[PDB]
């Protein structure tokens, strides 16, 4: 019935509708993105609130730090090392002293005690407490470089 | 056959109207939404900050968590013990310098031999 006229038109618009629908959905996508974002006045708020909220923690850190309420990993290392240094310095200077006191005792053929009494050398503390101190709290070795690594 | 193929053209006209009105509603809603939200170097440099800060927080609370790991009772225990040991190390230092006095000015021993025997070194000092 020369329906080519009409059966062509369907094809024409079957192309047209499709175009708009495949364009249509695109709009939807972007508007979704638009509905999922805050305005630029509210986003300007939330930021100057977060700024204050962060600055807050910077102050809390400044305080608990300045008050020595807390110990940093580097500091906890440094005290730890300084301890080794002292307990070493101690156990060392005692020894390299009492070993000379040894020779010098029988040099004069006399007890070490009275030698220390004459020269005016101090009793010391006992090693009873030193070793029980190493026991209580064990010294450890701590590299200076380790301490630099903790400080960053 | 003819009308059967005529109906398929009656479906797509209605479909086109519906799709057209839909697109209209869409462009409208965007037109209203793009009002508050407007892409700018400002809003751009802004969203980035609402993230930056947001993250910096999580970093901070991590910092805290980690900072509290360190027992200050121990820090003090250490602090006290070392004070003790250093006063003791300073004691035996004083005893060593005293043996230097006697050995040098009484037993007239060797100023070279004395150092080496006592343990006196370069930069031998009290612990401050």
Author numbering:
A (entry chain B): 79 to 230
B (entry chain A): 76 to 203
Paper excerpt:
Later, Hop2 and Mnd1 were found to work together as a complex that promotes homologous chromosome pairing and DSB repair during meiosis.
The heterodimeric complex of full-length G. lamblia Hop2 (231 residues) and Mnd1 (203 residues) was crystallized subsequently. After extensive crystal screening to collect suitable X-ray data sets, the structure of Hop2–Mnd1 was determined by the single wavelength anomalous dispersion method using a selenomethionine-derivatized crystal. Only one Hop2–Mnd1 heterodimer, referred to as Heterodimer I, exhibited electron densities for nearly the entire length of the molecules. The N-terminal ∼70 residues of both Hop2 and Mnd1 fold into winged-helix domains (WHDs) that are juxtaposed to each other through conserved interactions. The following 161 residues of Hop2 and 131 residues of Mnd1 both fold into three α-helices that are interrupted by two short non-helical regions.
